[PDB]
Write an enzyme that holds these catalytic residues in place. Structure first.
Site, PDB file in Angstrom:
ATOM      1  N   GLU A 177     -12.927 -14.862 -26.292  1.00 34.01           N
ATOM      2  CA  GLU A 177     -14.320 -15.209 -26.560  1.00 34.01           C
ATOM      3  C   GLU A 177     -15.144 -13.971 -26.898  1.00 34.01           C
ATOM      4  N   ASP A 218     -24.100 -21.037 -14.652  1.00 33.56           N
ATOM      5  CA  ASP A 218     -23.123 -21.902 -13.994  1.00 33.56           C
ATOM      6  C   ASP A 218     -22.228 -21.025 -13.129  1.00 33.56           C
ATOM      7  N   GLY A 232       1.638   5.512  12.953  1.00 37.75           N
ATOM      8  CA  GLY A 232       2.696   5.046  12.083  1.00 37.75           C
ATOM      9  C   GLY A 232       3.946   4.653  12.826  1.00 37.75           C
ATOM     10  N   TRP A 270     -15.072 -23.646 -25.763  1.00 43.09           N
ATOM     11  CA  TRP A 270     -16.155 -24.128 -26.610  1.00 43.09           C
ATOM     12  C   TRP A 270     -15.853 -25.481 -27.241  1.00 43.09           C
ATOM     13  N   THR A 293      -5.869   0.727   5.033  1.00 43.70           N
ATOM     14  CA  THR A 293      -5.983   1.005   3.606  1.00 43.70           C
ATOM     15  C   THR A 293      -5.131  -0.016   2.860  1.00 43.70           C
ATOM     16  N   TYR A 352     -24.018 -16.708 -30.252  1.00 44.38           N
ATOM     17  CA  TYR A 352     -23.458 -15.401 -29.931  1.00 44.38           C
ATOM     18  C   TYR A 352     -22.549 -14.931 -31.057  1.00 44.38           C
ATOM     19  N   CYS A 369     -26.962 -18.364 -23.314  1.00 43.59           N
ATOM     20  CA  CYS A 369     -27.098 -18.255 -21.865  1.00 43.59           C
ATOM     21  C   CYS A 369     -27.252 -16.799 -21.434  1.00 43.59           C
ATOM     22  N   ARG A 376     -30.304 -16.441 -18.762  1.00 43.31           N
ATOM     23  CA  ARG A 376     -31.323 -17.443 -18.457  1.00 43.31           C
ATOM     24  C   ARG A 376     -30.785 -18.553 -17.562  1.00 43.31           C
TER      25      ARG A 376
HETATM   26  N1  LIG Z   1       1.837   3.584   5.204  1.00 43.23           N
HETATM   27  C1  LIG Z   1       1.668   4.163   6.508  1.00 43.23           C
HETATM   28  O1  LIG Z   1       0.538   4.201   7.021  1.00 43.23           O
HETATM   29  C2  LIG Z   1       2.849   4.738   7.266  1.00 43.23           C
HETATM   30  C3  LIG Z   1       4.144   4.526   6.769  1.00 43.23           C
HETATM   31  N2  LIG Z   1       5.217   5.017   7.413  1.00 43.23           N
HETATM   32  C4  LIG Z   1       6.518   4.778   6.868  1.00 43.23           C
HETATM   33  O2  LIG Z   1       7.259   3.929   7.679  1.00 43.23           O
HETATM   34  C5  LIG Z   1       8.586   4.449   7.747  1.00 43.23           C
HETATM   35  C6  LIG Z   1       8.875   4.880   9.106  1.00 43.23           C
HETATM   36  O3  LIG Z   1       8.468   4.030  10.149  1.00 43.23           O
HETATM   37  P1  LIG Z   1       9.578   3.342  11.107  1.00 43.23           P
HETATM   38  O4  LIG Z   1      10.757   2.862  10.246  1.00 43.23           O
HETATM   39  O5  LIG Z   1       8.988   2.142  11.819  1.00 43.23           O
HETATM   40  O6  LIG Z   1      10.075   4.415  12.175  1.00 43.23           O
HETATM   41  P2  LIG Z   1       9.177   4.889  13.407  1.00 43.23           P
HETATM   42  O7  LIG Z   1       8.051   5.753  12.917  1.00 43.23           O
HETATM   43  O8  LIG Z   1       8.613   3.703  14.163  1.00 43.23           O
HETATM   44  O9  LIG Z   1      10.040   5.705  14.372  1.00 43.23           O
HETATM   45  C7  LIG Z   1      10.998   5.055  15.161  1.00 43.23           C
HETATM   46  C8  LIG Z   1      11.530   5.793  16.315  1.00 43.23           C
HETATM   47  O10 LIG Z   1      10.577   5.826  17.356  1.00 43.23           O
HETATM   48  C9  LIG Z   1      11.282   5.677  18.579  1.00 43.23           C
HETATM   49  N3  LIG Z   1      10.948   4.455  19.228  1.00 43.23           N
HETATM   50  C10 LIG Z   1      10.370   3.369  18.657  1.00 43.23           C
HETATM   51  N4  LIG Z   1      10.205   2.410  19.590  1.00 43.23           N
HETATM   52  C11 LIG Z   1      10.683   2.887  20.788  1.00 43.23           C
HETATM   53  C12 LIG Z   1      10.783   2.361  22.099  1.00 43.23           C
HETATM   54  N5  LIG Z   1      10.294   0.986  22.374  1.00 43.23           N
HETATM   55  N6  LIG Z   1      11.323   3.110  23.099  1.00 43.23           N
HETATM   56  C13 LIG Z   1      11.764   4.367  22.824  1.00 43.23           C
HETATM   57  N7  LIG Z   1      11.692   4.907  21.604  1.00 43.23           N
HETATM   58  C14 LIG Z   1      11.151   4.184  20.555  1.00 43.23           C
HETATM   59  C15 LIG Z   1      12.689   5.704  18.233  1.00 43.23           C
HETATM   60  O11 LIG Z   1      13.084   7.045  18.206  1.00 43.23           O
HETATM   61  P3  LIG Z   1      14.518   7.472  18.640  1.00 43.23           P
HETATM   62  O12 LIG Z   1      15.531   6.962  17.596  1.00 43.23           O
HETATM   63  O13 LIG Z   1      14.579   8.941  18.723  1.00 43.23           O
HETATM   64  O14 LIG Z   1      14.841   6.898  19.983  1.00 43.23           O
HETATM   65  C16 LIG Z   1      12.693   5.136  16.910  1.00 43.23           C
HETATM   66  O15 LIG Z   1      13.862   5.426  16.228  1.00 43.23           O
HETATM   67  C17 LIG Z   1       8.634   5.574   6.808  1.00 43.23           C
HETATM   68  O16 LIG Z   1       8.981   5.112   5.542  1.00 43.23           O
HETATM   69  C18 LIG Z   1       7.291   6.039   6.789  1.00 43.23           C
HETATM   70  O17 LIG Z   1       7.033   6.740   5.609  1.00 43.23           O
HETATM   71  C19 LIG Z   1       5.077   5.738   8.567  1.00 43.23           C
HETATM   72  C20 LIG Z   1       3.808   5.972   9.088  1.00 43.23           C
HETATM   73  C21 LIG Z   1       2.667   5.473   8.450  1.00 43.23           C
HETATM   74  C1  LIG Z   2       2.336   9.676   9.179  1.00 43.03           C
HETATM   75  N1  LIG Z   2       1.965   9.843   7.800  1.00 43.03           N
HETATM   76  C2  LIG Z   2       2.221   8.789   6.846  1.00 43.03           C
HETATM   77  C3  LIG Z   2       0.940   8.116   6.436  1.00 43.03           C
HETATM   78  C4  LIG Z   2       0.534   8.127   5.097  1.00 43.03           C
HETATM   79  N2  LIG Z   2      -0.628   7.518   4.776  1.00 43.03           N
HETATM   80  C5  LIG Z   2      -1.389   6.911   5.745  1.00 43.03           C
HETATM   81  N3  LIG Z   2      -2.565   6.297   5.404  1.00 43.03           N
HETATM   82  C6  LIG Z   2      -3.302   5.705   6.359  1.00 43.03           C
HETATM   83  N4  LIG Z   2      -4.535   5.064   5.982  1.00 43.03           N
HETATM   84  N5  LIG Z   2      -2.925   5.691   7.646  1.00 43.03           N
HETATM   85  C7  LIG Z   2      -1.775   6.283   8.032  1.00 43.03           C
HETATM   86  N6  LIG Z   2      -1.363   6.277   9.399  1.00 43.03           N
HETATM   87  C8  LIG Z   2      -0.967   6.920   7.061  1.00 43.03           C
HETATM   88  N7  LIG Z   2       0.204   7.529   7.403  1.00 43.03           N
HETATM   89  C9  LIG Z   2       1.278  11.050   7.376  1.00 43.03           C
HETATM   90  C10 LIG Z   2       0.368  11.652   8.238  1.00 43.03           C
HETATM   91  C11 LIG Z   2      -0.306  12.801   7.839  1.00 43.03           C
HETATM   92  C12 LIG Z   2      -0.077  13.346   6.585  1.00 43.03           C
HETATM   93  C13 LIG Z   2      -0.838  14.586   6.195  1.00 43.03           C
HETATM   94  O1  LIG Z   2      -0.336  15.411   5.452  1.00 43.03           O
HETATM   95  N8  LIG Z   2      -2.173  14.786   6.716  1.00 43.03           N
HETATM   96  C14 LIG Z   2      -2.953  15.946   6.383  1.00 43.03           C
HETATM   97  C15 LIG Z   2      -3.713  15.657   5.134  1.00 43.03           C
HETATM   98  C16 LIG Z   2      -4.113  16.786   4.235  1.00 43.03           C
HETATM   99  C17 LIG Z   2      -5.089  16.450   3.153  1.00 43.03           C
HETATM  100  O2  LIG Z   2      -4.740  15.657   2.241  1.00 43.03           O
HETATM  101  O3  LIG Z   2      -6.309  16.643   3.358  1.00 43.03           O
HETATM  102  C18 LIG Z   2      -3.932  16.147   7.474  1.00 43.03           C
HETATM  103  O4  LIG Z   2      -4.555  17.246   7.586  1.00 43.03           O
HETATM  104  O5  LIG Z   2      -4.139  15.213   8.292  1.00 43.03           O
HETATM  105  C19 LIG Z   2       0.829  12.739   5.718  1.00 43.03           C
HETATM  106  C20 LIG Z   2       1.505  11.585   6.114  1.00 43.03           C
HETATM  107  N1  LIG Z   3     -10.372 -22.476 -12.304  1.00 40.94           N
HETATM  108  C1  LIG Z   3     -11.297 -21.791 -12.979  1.00 40.94           C
HETATM  109  O1  LIG Z   3     -12.242 -21.240 -12.427  1.00 40.94           O
HETATM  110  C2  LIG Z   3     -11.098 -21.703 -14.463  1.00 40.94           C
HETATM  111  C3  LIG Z   3      -9.797 -21.611 -14.989  1.00 40.94           C
HETATM  112  C4  LIG Z   3      -9.604 -21.540 -16.379  1.00 40.94           C
HETATM  113  C5  LIG Z   3     -10.697 -21.566 -17.279  1.00 40.94           C
HETATM  114  C6  LIG Z   3     -10.373 -21.482 -18.755  1.00 40.94           C
HETATM  115  O2  LIG Z   3     -11.160 -21.806 -19.643  1.00 40.94           O
HETATM  116  O3  LIG Z   3      -9.115 -21.016 -19.021  1.00 40.94           O
HETATM  117  C7  LIG Z   3     -12.025 -21.671 -16.750  1.00 40.94           C
HETATM  118  N2  LIG Z   3     -13.177 -21.692 -17.598  1.00 40.94           N
HETATM  119  C8  LIG Z   3     -13.760 -22.677 -18.311  1.00 40.94           C
HETATM  120  O4  LIG Z   3     -13.356 -23.837 -18.366  1.00 40.94           O
HETATM  121  C9  LIG Z   3     -14.980 -22.240 -19.078  1.00 40.94           C
HETATM  122  C10 LIG Z   3     -15.617 -23.119 -19.985  1.00 40.94           C
HETATM  123  C11 LIG Z   3     -16.757 -22.703 -20.705  1.00 40.94           C
HETATM  124  C12 LIG Z   3     -17.282 -21.403 -20.537  1.00 40.94           C
HETATM  125  C13 LIG Z   3     -18.516 -20.956 -21.306  1.00 40.94           C
HETATM  126  C14 LIG Z   3     -19.394 -22.136 -21.638  1.00 40.94           C
HETATM  127  C15 LIG Z   3     -19.738 -22.569 -22.899  1.00 40.94           C
HETATM  128  N3  LIG Z   3     -20.545 -23.683 -22.767  1.00 40.94           N
HETATM  129  C16 LIG Z   3     -20.716 -23.963 -21.433  1.00 40.94           C
HETATM  130  N4  LIG Z   3     -21.464 -25.009 -20.913  1.00 40.94           N
HETATM  131  C17 LIG Z   3     -21.475 -25.073 -19.608  1.00 40.94           C
HETATM  132  N5  LIG Z   3     -22.152 -26.031 -18.884  1.00 40.94           N
HETATM  133  N6  LIG Z   3     -20.804 -24.174 -18.765  1.00 40.94           N
HETATM  134  C18 LIG Z   3     -20.069 -23.146 -19.234  1.00 40.94           C
HETATM  135  O5  LIG Z   3     -19.485 -22.366 -18.484  1.00 40.94           O
HETATM  136  C19 LIG Z   3     -20.022 -23.030 -20.710  1.00 40.94           C
HETATM  137  C20 LIG Z   3     -16.652 -20.524 -19.634  1.00 40.94           C
HETATM  138  C21 LIG Z   3     -15.512 -20.937 -18.916  1.00 40.94           C
HETATM  139  C22 LIG Z   3     -12.196 -21.742 -15.346  1.00 40.94           C
END
Ligand SMILES: NC(=O)C1=CN([C@@H]2O[C@H](COP(=O)(O)OP(=O)(O)OC[C@H]3O[C@@H](n4cnc5c(N)ncnc54)[C@H](OP(=O)(O)O)[C@@H]3O)[C@@H](O)[C@H]2O)C=CC1
Ligand SMILES: CN(Cc1cnc2nc(N)nc(N)c2n1)c1ccc(C(=O)N[C@@H](CCC(=O)O)C(=O)O)cc1
Ligand SMILES: NC(=O)c1ccc(C(=O)O)c(NC(=O)c2ccc(Cc3c[nH]c4nc(N)[nH]c(=O)c34)cc2)c1
Ligand SMILES: NC(=O)C1=CN([C@@H]2O[C@H](COP(=O)(O)OP(=O)(O)OC[C@H]3O[C@@H](n4cnc5c(N)ncnc54)[C@H](OP(=O)(O)O)[C@@H]3O)[C@@H](O)[C@H]2O)C=CC1
Ligand SMILES: CN(Cc1cnc2nc(N)nc(N)c2n1)c1ccc(C(=O)N[C@@H](CCC(=O)O)C(=O)O)cc1
Ligand SMILES: NC(=O)c1ccc(C(=O)O)c(NC(=O)c2ccc(Cc3c[nH]c4nc(N)[nH]c(=O)c34)cc2)c1
Ligand SMILES: O=c1[nH]c(=O)n([C@H]2C[C@H](O)[C@@H](COP(=O)(O)O)O2)cc1F
Ligand SMILES: O=c1[nH]c(=O)n([C@H]2C[C@H](O)[C@@H](COP(=O)(O)O)O2)cc1F
Lengths: 505, 506
Positions: A278, A410, A112, A300, A132, A326, A386, A407
């Site tokens: 529909e 399209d 992270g 239709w 994720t 239908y 259909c 059957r």
């Molecule tokens: N959705 C997810 O998977 C995750 C989300 N997050 C979220 O992101 C946010 C935090 O991430 P973020 O804002 O990027 O902060 P960071 O986790 O990247 O932490 C930043 C700190 O790391 C140190 N650091 C980073 N780059 C350098 C470098 N080139 N040289 C030396 N030190 C460095 C600095 O620490 P220092 O200031 O001490 O020098 C910096 O302040 C949170 O909201 C967190 O919840 C975090 C992890 C995972």
């Molecule tokens: C750094 N961070 C933020 C966070 C949240 N979601 C993420 N999701 C993904 N996919 N990847 C990440 N790096 C990530 N990071 C974290 C990391 C660990 C835990 C944590 O509590 N981990 C427990 C989870 C406990 C449990 O839910 O089983 C562990 O045992 O690893 C929470 C936030």
């Molecule tokens: N961009 C898109 O993918 C898109 C966006 C909007 C619509 C919208 O209608 O809002 C859409 N759908 C149709 O036009 C549409 C038209 C008809 C039927 C059912 C049917 C009845 N008789 C049919 N005879 C033939 N040959 N073939 C068929 O499918 C049908 C299902 C759907 C497609």
């Protein structure tokens, strides 16, 4: 020389990871994933090293993580030696000494810090990336995960999971016997299309969505994209009743989970409201196309115009009177059809009501079936069904799964609509019958792509899928007909732009 | 040190390979396979060596094989040096000198001779085995391929191919002695329980997997049935049903079978093909009289057509074996007002089969070739609601007829093999009547289950390695589909494992 992996949880679009010194979400399963992936080791006499920035070290309360060694990058933190589980380094480069010496460290994780991530990717220290993807974008971020460089390719994409109505995905990025294959190739050279494998050729890379994911295509949107690819690869060029020819194959299937997500395609913005309209039009038993047109749903219109009706032999029929289709076989099967204005309450077999009654009275029954194929009424229909047949199944843990035989499919227009529509229908039946949604399997006969969609669908195949959204109901209805569009909430749907495709009449 | 592979074509049961100094069959594709597998090399500046006995060398006319070097084992043949493509050795051991020296030899193939095979396996020189299994057993052999030693395991089994109505298979045997994705998936499956859909579709354990050593080469389409059995044994939920016998059940499965080069009749168990044909023609004729099946010594519908069962399901008024409007009454008289099995229904209802045939041969690319049996208006009158519920048919551009079948409920022990063979036969009949060739058969299943009184039996069936599918041919071309007779069907090359008795749940 050992492995180095970034572990990060970032938002799906803007890659936000933090806000005001904490996380912008609370997902327990994601923390459990972090724990299990950072504890995963081979040698029991070794530990894993978790590198994190100082602000990240503050975020976790400045307390060690069990069984692991924490490495804090800081320029001001005192290099304390009291705690053997926490060590401080002045820069990221010196902290990679876990490689040079310290054979008690097996694997290294960059855990992270936007700065830590950025200068770990810039310094090319990272071998793997565990990402994720969280479907939360209309919130505030102040810390972002940097863009993944082109030297990385995705090799895995999990199914969509749900926590507190929040969708999320798990992905892996990596920096980048033959005898059986040779024998199969020789047999395919000898026998032509006589070998069934040659009739189901694997799609070429140029038409395969995200080809670098070879063994980890777990996201169930791949069930649709890979069918697109299979049709593009093996589809025979065939004519049909419309002027637009298709590329067609026969006999395919798609599986979708509905427990942890809603299968609405993300590689293209899908008109979910028209789908719901529909479906509820079907459920109410309605065959009046004007009721759909009044709600600004025009799907239709093509199959319900005066010219089309006169052409297929229904010139006597009113403008948008689609006939017994239908929703007339659903509620009044084998009912004597007259017009769309008549009263049919009581006539025919109400398949939907009997289905609901059997689902909540005999769940393990093996006959939960809803059919629309009525040979006696096909001639009166503006279009034969259909999505022909559906079956429903109640699991032992009280989930409702659905199978659909279709059957004709399209793939450009009809298929996403069918997926979303039968998903919504299964969810409605589950709520009305007191179950949870299960799985959705779609079995397809003639799966085809219209030739005027080739440009479009190929474009759609260039977009890496995003996690499925969630679909929730705001209230519990008393009858399945009472569902309204305002009752449906679509949470976390961030699709790619709309792809316009014309319908073949 | 390079690779050594036996290449052999042997019969399926007795492993016969020769008779009177020649082959007991004529399969051109197998000779082409021999050629392509012995010519397959990596270095263009090297050749492959083909070891064969002297009588085998006589069988091929004593002429060299293009691009390869033949090694003849003989004690009397003159060690000639004129032909550089043929070399003679006095024993098999000395001929393995290709390993020690002669770096121009890339791979070595033991190509024939019962003696050569036998003392190449006994001397443990063989790394791989390419076996062509031929389904011909009622002929005379004088030369046999020795039994494959336990040090070899099969890793590949192709689909069944057909030449001159002869079925054959291709198999590979081998002698035996990234992880990041798997680890991440395992961790996700530990975190999420049945919440992760993969945990609801777990891969079958080895103990319930048929021929487990074949991991990446399960091409034989009988594996489509055995692997479904395995999936049910692995993930099947224990559930009760209308019968007293509970099942292990899963929901949503599929099976594919080729019908161009073979007939999908299971070989891991002798299947009553005659009863299948009789039930199918009983369906086609429109008949619902179970006595017509009992008179032909077919008793599969006796259980669901007894006085006790009919009285129990609420049809006590019905005659003994009057099954009601079921399969073949919805086929020929759909939505017809049913009375008894003795009445005349000619003209009433929709004749789905006739319209299907007419549309198949008049509009082949039509996407509505559908035959349904699910009639909500008649379900209460049926002795049993339809299991094979709906079917669709498709005409390929090369004039082949493929079939899809949706089946709501699948008894994997008894009903499933019958359904597979039955819809294969039906598709073949429709193809002959409409002037097409058979294509593919896909079966889509809702509730796929195993009855608990079948568990031992099916497990026995899972211990038997599959054999190549047989062929099924028609002796004459009928003018109407109703004219098919059991004598008109010829089943060629069916050598199944013994029958496995399984009781039906009423
Ligand atoms: N959705 C997810 O998977 C995750 C989300 N997050 C979220 O992101 C946010 C935090 O991430 P973020 O804002 O990027 O902060 P960071 O986790 O990247 O932490 C930043 C700190 O790391 C140190 N650091 C980073 N780059 C350098 C470098 N080139 N040289 C030396 N030190 C460095 C600095 O620490 P220092 O200031 O001490 O020098 C910096 O302040 C949170 O909201 C967190 O919840 C975090 C992890 C995972
Ligand atoms: C750094 N961070 C933020 C966070 C949240 N979601 C993420 N999701 C993904 N996919 N990847 C990440 N790096 C990530 N990071 C974290 C990391 C660990 C835990 C944590 O509590 N981990 C427990 C989870 C406990 C449990 O839910 O089983 C562990 O045992 O690893 C929470 C936030
Ligand atoms: N961009 C898109 O993918 C898109 C966006 C909007 C619509 C919208 O209608 O809002 C859409 N759908 C149709 O036009 C549409 C038209 C008809 C039927 C059912 C049917 C009845 N008789 C049919 N005879 C033939 N040959 N073939 C068929 O499918 C049908 C299902 C759907 C497609
Ligand atoms: N289905 C298949 O894949 C194949 C089938 N076949 C069939 O098998 C039949 C012939 O094979 P088979 O009867 O076994 O005859 P072989 O091919 O095994 O040839 C036998 C001869 O090899 C020589 N030989 C064998 N062992 C020794 C030894 N230890 N030392 C010295 N010389 C040895 C002897 O020749 P010598 O008398 O000169 O000393 C012996 O007579 C034919 O019908 C043929 O068509 C053949 C090849 C492949
Ligand atoms: C020794 N023998 C008998 C024979 C017949 N079938 C077999 N089949 C198999 N799978 N394996 C064998 N060793 C085998 N051997 C042979 C060997 C080569 C040819 C032969 O004519 N080979 C040509 C093939 C000609 C073709 O194109 O059909 C070649 O180029 O290799 C015939 C019989
Ligand atoms: N397995 C063998 O080795 C073997 C050997 C011989 C026969 C034979 O009959 O000659 C045989 N088949 C049957 O007994 C049999 C019986 C019935 C049905 C169709 C059916 C109708 N109602 C059913 N209700 C249930 N629960 N289940 C069913 O399958 C059927 C299909 C097949 C199997
Ligand atoms: O729900 C539907 N799903 C669908 O895929 N189609 C398409 C399938 C086919 O491309 C077209 C008409 O089918 P067919 O021409 O075979 O009668 O409508 C129509 C629907 F109403
Ligand atoms: O052709 C058939 N195929 C089949 O699989 N069954 C089995 C399926 C199930 O085990 C039993 C009864 O089905 P259900 O209890 O769902 O009505 O018959 C019966 C047939 F006639």
């Amino acid at each position: 020389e050992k492995n180095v992996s970034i572990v990060v949880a970032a938002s799906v679009l803007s890659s936000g990871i933090g806000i005001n010194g904490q996380l912008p979400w609370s997902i327990s399963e994601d923390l459990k994933f972090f724990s299990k992936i950072t504890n995963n080791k081979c040698d029991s006499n070794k530990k894993n090293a978790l590198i994190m920035g100082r602000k990240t070290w503050d975020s976790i309360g400045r307390r060690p993580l069990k069984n692991r060694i924490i490495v804090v990058i800081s320029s001001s933190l005192p290099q304390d030696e009291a705690d053997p589980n926490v060590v401080v380094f002045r820069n990221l480069e010196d902290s990679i000494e876990n490689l040079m010496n310290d054979d008690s460290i097996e694997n290294i994780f960059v855990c992270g810090g936007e700065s830590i991530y950025r200068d770990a990717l810039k310094d090319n220290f990272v071998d793997r990336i565990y990402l994720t993807r969280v479907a939360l974008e209309d919130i505030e971020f102040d810390t972002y995960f940097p863009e993944i460089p082109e030297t990385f390719l995705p090799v895995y994409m999990s199914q969509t999971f749900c926590t507190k109505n929040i969708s999320y995905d798990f992905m892996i990025f990596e920096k980048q016997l033959k005898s059986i294959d040779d024998t199969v190739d020789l047999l395919g050279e000898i026998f032509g299309i006589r070998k069934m494998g040659n009739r189901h050729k694997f799609p070429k890379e140029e038409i395969y969505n995200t080809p670098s994911i070879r063994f980890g295509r777990e996201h169930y949107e791949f069930q649709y994209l890979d069918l697109l690819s299979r049709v593009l690869e093996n589809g025979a060029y065939r004519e049909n009743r419309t002027g637009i020819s298709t590329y067609s194959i026969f006999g395919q299937m798609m599986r979708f989970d509905m427990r942890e997500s809603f299968p609405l395609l993300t590689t293209k913005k899908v008109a979910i409201r028209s789908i719901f309209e529909e479906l509820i039009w079907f459920i109410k038993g309605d065959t009046n196309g004007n009721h759909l047109i009044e709600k600004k749903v025009y799907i239709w219109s093509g199959n319900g115009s005066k010219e089309y009706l006169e052409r297929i032999g229904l010139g006597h029929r009113e403008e948008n009177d689609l006939g017994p289709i239908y929703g007339f076989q659903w509620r009044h099967y084998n009912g004597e059809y007259k017009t769309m204005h008549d009263d049919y309450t009581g006539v025919g077999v109400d398949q939907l009501a009997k289905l609901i009654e059997t689902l909540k009275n005999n769940p393990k029954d093996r006959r939960h079936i809803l059919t629309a194929w009525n040979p006696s009424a096909l001639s009166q229909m503006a279009l034969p069904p259909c999505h022909v047949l559906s079956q429903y199944y109640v699991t032992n843990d009280n989930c409702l799964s659905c199978n659909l035989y279709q059957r004709s499919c399209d793939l450009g227009l009809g298929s996403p609509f069918n997926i979303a529509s039968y998903a919504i229908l299964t969810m409605m039946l589950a709520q009305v019958c007191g179950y949870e949604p299960g799985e959705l399997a779609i079995f397809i006969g003639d799966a085809h792509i219209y030739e005027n969609h080739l440009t479009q669908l190929k474009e759609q195949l260039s977009r890496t899928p995003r996690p499925f959204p969630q679909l929730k109901f705001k209230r519990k209805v008393e009858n399945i007909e009472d569902f309204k569009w305002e009752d449906i909430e679509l949470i976390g749907y961030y699709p790619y732009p709309t792809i316009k495709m014309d319908m073949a009449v």
